[PDB]
Design a binder for this molecule. Structure first.
Ligand code: DGT
Ligand code: CA
Length: 579
DNA sequence: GCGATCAGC
DNA sequence: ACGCTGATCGCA
């Protein structure tokens, strides 16, 4: 019902200088995953190619790797990484329909070509789920069915580039696609393929020690409980805490008693068992998610873990990281932080180098809000988190601990993103009127921040969306909802998205600038991870001194704001040591 | 499969 | 009743 050549060999007319290209990888995790078929649509026709022939054809491989032969694709990072695992380089991607759809409207949740095509009233293509099936029934269909699907997806991409580019241009997002997200996709593909090396001997020994400590704590909980029970069972735990031990009920869930850590911490004066339950959970969290989970995904022959950075998922323009998530490796408690000792350089005599933007969203907010006092604070290189901790806990600078500062951090961001007196009082364990007067004092010091938050909510109502500094967009239909609670969540999104999203814009530009600089200096150093406002690299030890000057400078100069950007950086023989 | 929970930013 | 996430696991 769509014509195409089911080709047995590659021909010259398949190798035009512009084409839509589909390199199909069906497995969710595309690392070392099979390529099940290829389609090309260009000015000369539509073609389906079997990968075992196309990817062993030297002319097709050369075409793939020629940056002057332009390809339009959907999720080009998936194809590039899968091809890297086949020993093949993909260059010349000039249009990525996934990233274009994501910029136009992140809320569509576009996960396949059919979903993107629907945005422009193109429906001559099926959803991938309809072709491949779900769950245990998922399967590559018969070749004529597969080939037509890949050809229809390629035809859709061929047709849709122009209407997507037109709307991107109207939104002031066409350079955001072509000069930011598409170049970033290639950099992320390199990062994911490189992977991070793991010291599995250390992780395994940590897991054995964790298991013993878990037993010791488990028994102590049984003794304090007077009985043995399933500590992981909410119904049993709730019974033990709030029926057998008769502890106060401070909070309920939709199905029973809450036992979240904030509740447990508040019950510490009443019974020693609650702090043991906290210790028990934290140990089990390390064991399940970061020892066992990481060992499950390490590639045994190389001892590398290969995350996938989802570039078209979050509603603010951040990345997310999956299987494993390398953006939430423990750091705040000392026993958890030691997991980072298992993240090592991939070569001998290389080291890990980490750099982080200082107080990034507050600096962005100062610029965007043009708050005279907040701008002056960063022009003085003040630490606003430390300043707030001094005021909260009524201490001097010298006596601010790592945990007090992390708590003042939640107060700072809470207040500028709409926390209520109730929420603030519940976080600082202070009276509600003390919380409300602190918030009032806060906005007396930063009245330009308060004005900005009022103005941006009105702007979201008037336009229907908010934007970031590099013109990322988020629609907020609920901002005019009649329901107070629905409308309120949308107002806090209007407050937060331009700030968090602009910080996401800045680090993405920094990554592109950094790679260009590393190439220009002919350095072996390369990116391994991004953690929202942090970049992690590895490099030969002989490159560290040059990197200490290079990397902070590129990051600091990525954009020019009304306040300085500041970068903290460290290096060491493991990720643990790079701080 | 979902919701609570908790690890990060 | 600040925002943005992903993984685990019991299921009231
Ligand atoms: N709404 C909200 N955003 C947060 C929170 N924690 C972190 N973020 C966002 C905003 C932060 O500026 C950004 C980077 O987080 P960091 O932990 O690195 O803190 P920040 O850069 O502000 O300070 P620092 O690096 O310690 O000088 O991530 C939070 O509790 N609430
Ligand atoms: Ca930071």
């Amino acid at each position: 019902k769509m014509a195409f050549t089911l080709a047995d060999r590659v021909t010259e007319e398949m190798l035009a200088d512009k084409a839509a290209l589909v390199v199909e990888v069906v497995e969710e995790n595309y690392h070392d995953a099979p390529i099940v078929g290829i389609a090309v649509v260009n000015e000369h026709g539509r073609f389906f190619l079997r990968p075992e022939t196309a990817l062993a054809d030297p002319q097709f491989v050369a075409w793939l790797g020629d940056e002057t032969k332009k390809k339009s694709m959907f999720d080009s990072k998936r194809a590039a990484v899968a091809l890297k695992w086949k020993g093949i380089e993909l260059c010349g991607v000039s249009f990525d329909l996934l990233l274009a759809a994501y910029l136009l409207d992140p809320a569509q949740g576009v996960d396949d070509v059919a979903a993107a095509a629907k945005m422009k009233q193109y429906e001559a293509v099926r959803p991938d789920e309809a072709v491949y099936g779900k769950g245990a029934k998922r399967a590559v269909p018969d070749e004529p069915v597969l080939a037509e699907h890949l050809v229809r997806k390629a035809a859709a991409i061929w047709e849709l580039e122009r209407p997507f580019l037109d709307e991107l241009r109207r939104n002031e997002q066409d350079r955001l696609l072509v000069e930011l997200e598409q170049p970033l996709s290639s950099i992320l593909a390199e990062m994911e393929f490189a992977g991070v090396k793991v010291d599995t001997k250390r992780l395994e020994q940590m897991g054995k020690e964790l298991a013993e400590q878990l037993g010791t704590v488990e028994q102590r909980i049984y003794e304090l409980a007077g009985q043995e029970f399933n500590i992981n069972s909410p119904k049993q735990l709730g019974v033990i805490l709030f029926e057998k031990l008769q502890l106060p009920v401070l909070k309920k869930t939709k199905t029973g008693y809450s036992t979240s850590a904030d509740v447990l911490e508040k019950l510490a004066p009443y019974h020693e068992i609650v702090e043991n339950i906290l210790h028990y959970r934290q140990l089990g969290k390390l064991q399940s998610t970061y020892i066992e989970g990481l060992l499950k995904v390490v590639r045994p022959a190389t001892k590398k873990v290969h995350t996938i950075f989802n570039q078209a998922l979050t509603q603010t323009g951040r990345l997310s990281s999956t299987e494993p998530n390398l953006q939430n490796i423990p750091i705040r408690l000392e026993e958890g932080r030691k997991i980072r000792q298992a993240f090592v350089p991939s070569e001998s005599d290389w080291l890990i180098f980490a750099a982080d933007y200082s107080q990034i969203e507050l600096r962005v907010l100062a610029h965007i809000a043009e708050d005279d006092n907040l701008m002056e604070a960063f022009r003085r290189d003040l630490d606003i988190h430390t300043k707030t901790a001094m005021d909260i806990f009524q201490v001097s600078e010298d006596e601010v601990t790592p945990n007090m500062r992390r708590q003042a951090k939640a107060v700072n961001f809470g207040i500028v993103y709409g926390i209520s007196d109730y929420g603030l009082a519940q976080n600082l364990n202070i009276s509600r009127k003390e919380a409300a007067e602190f918030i009032e004092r806060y906005f007396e010091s930063f009245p330009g921040v308060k004005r900005y938050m009022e103005n941006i909510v009105q702007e979201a109502k008037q336009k229907g969306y908010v934007t970031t500094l590099l013109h990322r967009r988020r629609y907020l239909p609920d901002i005019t909802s009649r329901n107070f609670n629905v409308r309120s969540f949308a107002e806090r999104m209007a407050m937060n998205t331009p700030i968090q999203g602009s910080a996401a814009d800045i680090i993405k530009k920094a990554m592109i600038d950094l790679n260009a600089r590393l190439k220009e200096e002919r350095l072996q150093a390369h990116l391994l991870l991004q953690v929202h406002d942090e970049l992690i690299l590895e490099a030969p030890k002989e490159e560290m001194e040059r990197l200490c000057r290079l990397v902070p400078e590129v990051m600091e100069q990525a954009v020019t704001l009304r306040v300085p950007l500041k970068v903290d950086y460290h290096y060491g023989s493991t990720w643990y040591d790079a701080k």
